[PDB]
Amino acid sequence: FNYTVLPSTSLAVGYYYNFLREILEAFNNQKSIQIILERDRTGKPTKTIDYEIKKPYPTIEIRVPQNLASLKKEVLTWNTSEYKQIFINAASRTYPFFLQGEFKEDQILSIFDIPTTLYASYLTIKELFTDSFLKTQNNERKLINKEIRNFERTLSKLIDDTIEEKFYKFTIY
Amino acid sequence: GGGMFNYTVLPSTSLAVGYYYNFLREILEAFNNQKSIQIILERDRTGKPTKTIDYEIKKPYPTIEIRVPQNLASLKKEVLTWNTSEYKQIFINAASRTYPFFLQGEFKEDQILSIFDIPTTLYASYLTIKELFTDSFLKTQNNERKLINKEIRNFERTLSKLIDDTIEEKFYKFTIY
Ligand SMILES: Nc1nc2c(ncn2[C@@H]2O[C@@H]3COP(=O)(O)O[C@H]4[C@@H](O)[C@H](n5cnc6c(=O)[nH]c(N)nc65)O[C@@H]4COP(=O)(O)O[C@H]3[C@H]2O)c(=O)[nH]1
């Protein structure tokens, strides 16, 4: 190339165009989402509610742990009775988009996701730098945060360029 | 790009890392952890699987065939064209992820010949190029195609390097069409 690219840049492009925008456009068309309540052993939906989405669209909360090395664990630990798995059958893809939602009684409070793609940032660092370098002067932590903040910044830049009103919140925990 | 924080990667490098560790390797570990595949036969008007067959995965595992169109700009359209009757949608409920992994299968009667995917993540490569470079540059000396070809070859090369640093199952073949 001519241009410097950080690893999380292309990950952010993909996350926006192959996930977030697909969910937004599925909202603006179908105005509805599928909530999974009961699932058989093969992890197959059996009891599924239709839930009509509204112009006051629920905010898509992207949550990323600073401990990016723990992300693949944090995606099985936030799976709790308080949350419910939802999915959206968009025309963009041959399989639906799966998300997590917070439900108070009959009301979707929020839709959250932990971006599994951002793990590839951590792995790409672990494979470009020597372990010696990473374990020196807290270098690994500085690289992980640069990659997270680059990810968030690229999403911001992508929403401005597409003249899209924000539809997401980005929180690091 | 070392001994300092001025490190560049090609866009397709981190995409390939994600595609391998967050998709290919997860399928392999579902196979190795004796998780069977679900074949979708019947679907409702919504598109919800009505009939599923369980299918047993045996240690001569089926080869994961990654197919990439040279016309990367059409990839999001190709992922809707190769959803035909001659191929069946399958899925694998792996313990790695809270939603299953969805693939396309080739079946001779009941035998699984091969599992194939078109890597949607590689579309991000094309979009990164369309965003970094001026329209003037991309149309000048066939620059757009040169960059896309380099991105596709880098993607396959990165996959090859990642299996080598781990275990050479060679569970995948990579063909450009
Ligand atoms: N919660 C949620 N997040 C979603 C969903 N679809 C996409 N994402 C997010 O968006 C990233 C980009 O997905 P992609 O561009 O299709 O690029 C994907 C795609 O090419 C492939 N892939 C991953 N899972 C599947 C799958 O179940 N089936 C197929 N056919 N390909 C998959 O691997 C790439 C990387 O996957 P990830 O590292 O997980 O990174 C994914 C993930 O972080 C979804 O339905 N739910």
Author numbering:
A (entry chain A): 159 to 331
B (entry chain B): 155 to 331
Reported in the publication:
In this study, we demonstrated two distinct mechanisms underlying the regulation of bacterial STINGs and a structural basis for cAA recognition and oligomerization.
We determined the crystal structure of one of the longer bacterial STINGs, Larkinella arboricola STING (LrSTING) to 2.73 Å resolution; the asymmetric unit contains six similar polypeptide chains of LrSTING (root mean square deviation of 0.3 − 0.5 Å for 127 − 149 Cα pairs), which assemble onto three V-shaped dimers with a cGG bound in the central ligand-binding pocket. LrSTING dimers are similar to previously determined cGG-bound bacterial STINGs (r.m.s.d. of 1.3 − 1.9 Å for 185 − 195 Cα pairs), with the exception that LrSTING contains strikingly longer β strands a and b (βa and βb). The longer βa and βb form a continuous β sheet with β1 and β2 and make extensive interactions with βa and βb of the other protomer, forming an additional long lid above the original lid. Superimposition of the three LrSTING dimers in the asymmetric unit revealed that their overall structures are nearly identical, except for significant conformational changes of the additional long lid, suggesting higher structural flexibility as indicated by B-factor values. In contrast, the long lid of LrSTING (chains CD) form one interchain H-bond (K202/T206) and one salt-bridge (R199/D208) at only one end, whereas the long lid of LrSTING (chains EF) does not interact with each other. In summary, these data suggested that the formation of an additional long lid of LrSTING results in autoinhibition, leading to attenuated E. coli toxicity and anti-phage ability.
